[PDB]
Design a protein around this ligand. Structure first.
Ligand SMILES: CC(=O)OC[C@H](N)C(=O)O
Ligand SMILES: CC(=O)OC[C@H](N)C(=O)O
Ligand SMILES: CC(=O)OC[C@H](N)C(=O)O
Ligand SMILES: CC(=O)OC[C@H](N)C(=O)O
Lengths: 239, 239
């Protein structure tokens, strides 16, 4: 019954983690209220996602920091998230509170790979601690990482949202927000892109704080740095 | 007890699907027989995988056809595989034998994206049938695709190995090898790369037909086209 007769299309370019763990709840809620809106989604590497929206092959770019290289157009903060190490229940780490930055580098690691979905930090957080960790697997997603944790190739380091008991209950979850700083999931779009009402509603559903007047004000400010500074005293969702 | 004291390293660059559904069985069997071999794995886009091995940041490149662009160095066929459409049990297709190329283009599609893991074929198989299918989601992996099939965004088209009952049992599997031609998973390496004994054993475990004398003969033939023609009368595994 509750249906908006809004006609139009919405092309979303994003990554695995976002489309896997952050998007599906929002996506199904969207198409159930906008049957006349043609929704198109494109998964790819974050460096290719920010190229789709610029060149007009996509409207929004829901990915992590990686859009910062592209000073091409508008960039809005959605939510913060942090990593969590996953180990077998038979692993020495499984038993510790709380693990530490130095105590994690003593094991083989299975993390994210450089640009896709949040890695450094890693290789880089360590640089800070002057550590040289042994990383034997750099994967794009977390479904791959956890499988090679069950295999025993090394200690996995994935997003917290990528772990849930009962979906993955033979694994051990350990918080590492004291170990690694949080990453900021952003949404990339253009000033030329006319923001439709179904677009505003989609953003505020993926990011409650990003209301129309908040979005418009951020667009009004002709700088991503000014936008990122507008939310200085404003708190974001933490996953 | 059964341990080879072979010292050395093995860097493998691959994709999601291979590392997800084809590699883990081989990987665990490898490290259990070569404890002194330092195994390193790198997941990435197929166009970036074939760049890792060339530039020496990886030894083997276990991915699909996409290595053909790179006439840089040796390319060995491992196994054939084909797609299978996944739908909800409440979907019209669920009920049909067997679906057909024309009868699939009448629905919204959720397939692989252009270069990563086997797409065209799609967009291209159709071209052949003069069809213009509505594809609303192009994803890198199949874990993403199936989630958006359960959501109901459209009909999914993934690898057959990406489906298994009891891992994904609320979905309906339909064979499409009569619909789409099979793809060839290849392994990319260099002639300069000295093939260690643990490397030969790894290949013949991932591809039974690729024994040492078969591998050496293919390397001896200084052309990938000659290699691909050597297996003309030789049958490959079919997944
Ligand atoms: C993991 C996740 O919940 O992502 C955040 C989501 N946009 C939200 O509804 O807050
Ligand atoms: C959703 C979450 O975990 O973050 C809460 C956030 N600090 C807020 O109140 O906006
Ligand atoms: C899916 C899969 O089995 O891949 C093929 C594998 N290399 C093999 O053992 O034949
Ligand atoms: C493993 C498979 O399904 O393929 C069999 C292949 N035709 C062979 O005999 O080599």
């Amino acid at each position: 019954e509750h249906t908006w007769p809004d006609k139009g299309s919405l092309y979303i370019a994003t990554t695995h983690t976002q489309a896997r763990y952050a998007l599906p709840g929002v996506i199904k809620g969207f198409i159930e209220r906008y049957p006349r809106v043609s929704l198109h989604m494109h998964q790819g590497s974050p460096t290719q996602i920010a190229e789709a929206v610029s060149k007009g092959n996509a409207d929004f770019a829901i990915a992590t920091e990686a859009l910062h290289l592209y000073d091409d157009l508008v960039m809005l903060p959605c939510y913060h998230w942090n990593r969590s190490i996953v180990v077998t229940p038979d692993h020495p780490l499984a038993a510790t509170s709380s693990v530490t930055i130095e105590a994690l580098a003593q094991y083989p690691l299975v993390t994210y790979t450089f640009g896709f979905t949040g890695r450094s930090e890693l290789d880089t957080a360590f640089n800070r601690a002057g550590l040289t960790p042994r990383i034997v697997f750099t994967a794009t997603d977390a479904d791959v990482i956890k499988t090679y944790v069950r295999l025993g190739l090394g200690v996995g380091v994935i997003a917290s949202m990528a772990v849930d008991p009962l979906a993955d209950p033979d694994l051990v979850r350990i918080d590492a927000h004291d170990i690694f700083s949080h990453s900021t999931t952003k949404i990339g779009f253009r000033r030329s892109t006319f923001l439709r009402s179904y677009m505003y509603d989609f953003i505020q559903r993926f990011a409650p704080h990003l209301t129309r007047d908040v979005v418009d004000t951020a667009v009004a400010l002709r700088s991503n740095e000014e936008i990122e500074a507008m939310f200085q005293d404003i708190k974001l969702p933490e996953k």
